[PDB]
């Protein structure tokens, strides 16, 4: 077993999550971090080859349970409509190094797709806390010399806005600890507490491309009035979905796949 | 194939070990604890019975590779002279919780000492940080109706007195990584930080028990003037034993045996 998986759940039961995070990032100095000068390489995932003239891409967030083991859910719902590429995160499997700073990592997966694609249109579709990174990737892609086609976000909570909700959900992530398709050993945790320091210094920029949210449904509890729901500081158009945070996409992947079919046909 | 193994290694090549400990104790605060008002025990590791009048109780260490397993060497040395009742430090092997302070660990280990003993005299002993634990066990027994005949502080390094010396050793241990007797498991490295803050703000008390400090012969390397080796405030006879801070026990057990007898012969 392990030693950290123990404190993970003993924190959520009482209420001392914040103090735990200040501990984690403390160990993020003792490794072999890379930069745009040495050498690295990854190998894409083999998934679907379905029909379509516009393919879609996707990725994962930070919440431990992330991985290329759970998106096979939406894979079946989207088949017939369009293809789906699988871009894995650099680290979740024996034999890998860690980043150096926020605007450094992006010079890696940039070159990889500029070799395999060719001349096909695409779009993005992330989830969870990761809905921040999915936005950041589209920025460097815009002026390098190859603009996207349109993003579709799903539940988010960016910095410089709501100081309450955020850390309030992480407290729940430790209490709601039902099993996942993969075991939680001594590697999938040190990465979670690592991006915490990163996501606290970023602040969005103003761009001009078509956005689309897909909000949730029934609240976790007997919550008061208007004290939730995402609200980005820019401008966009929205569409809902029936469900809740922690699961949604799993047992509700057919729904969203239809909410996107109506979008791509106009804008 | 853990992760907390290399993280402890790469920390020695750079030169930062202090801030690495502030966290080890942060993680342990979450594990289940024992302070005196809860069930928990520890079977004294049976070493070798035999002749004698004043058995040597040798408490376990506080390092990563510590435990009553190391005292196997000294156990064979004391065959005929005096037996060894090596007290196991909790938290290191799978399943055992961690204490609150020093008066939480030395207490639980005190119970086992009186139980198996009885009207038979004994002399506690340890090694460096483990000696801080050994003394604490011997002092707690002082006014508790069972003051041991004495102690043998082998290369003990008292905190608050040796700032640069004791800390430079931890920085050396990391670069001394080379095949251990018992695999450096995850639950051992966490217990390190636990005991670090315990023995950290722990200032020993005075007693009328004879102490026999055992220092080293050759330094850990090139040393200018007299500023190495273990020290102590109270009155105690001191005697040296060859090998540096790491091989004065693992590769030099017998040399110490003849030293404690000449001491027990007096009073």
Curated annotation (Swiss-Prot), chains A, B:
Name of the protein described by the UniProt record: Erythronolide synthase EryA3
Biological role stated in the UniProt entry: Involved in the biosynthesis of antibiotic erythromycin via the biosynthesis of its aglycone precursor, 6-deoxyerythronolide B (6-dEB).
Species this chain originates from: Saccharopolyspora erythraea (Streptomyces erythraeus)
Active site: 128 (nucleophile), 245 (proton acceptor)
Superkingdom of the organism of origin: Bacteria
Subunit details: Homodimer. Erythronolide synthase is composed of EryAI, EryAII and EryAIII multimodular (2 modules) polypeptides each coding for a functional synthase subunit which participates in 2 of the six FAS-like elongation steps required for formation of the polyketide. Module 1, 2, 3, 4, 5, and 6 participating in biosynthesis steps 1, 2, 3, 4, 5, and 6, respectively.
Segments for region (Thioesterase): 57-263
Entire protein: shown range: 2904 to 3170 of 3172
Further comment: Type I modular polyketide synthases (PKSs) catalyze the step-wise condensation of simple carboxylic acid derivatives. Organizationally, type I PKSs are arranged into modules, wherein each module is comprised of a set of catalytic activities that is responsible for a single elongation of the polyketide chain and the appropriate reductive processing of the beta-keto functionality. A minimal elongation module contains an acyl transferase (AT) domain, an acyl-carrier protein (ACP) domain, and a ketosynthase (KS) domain.
Positions of disulphide bridges: none
Originating gene: eryA
Residue positions binding substrate: 62, 129, 155
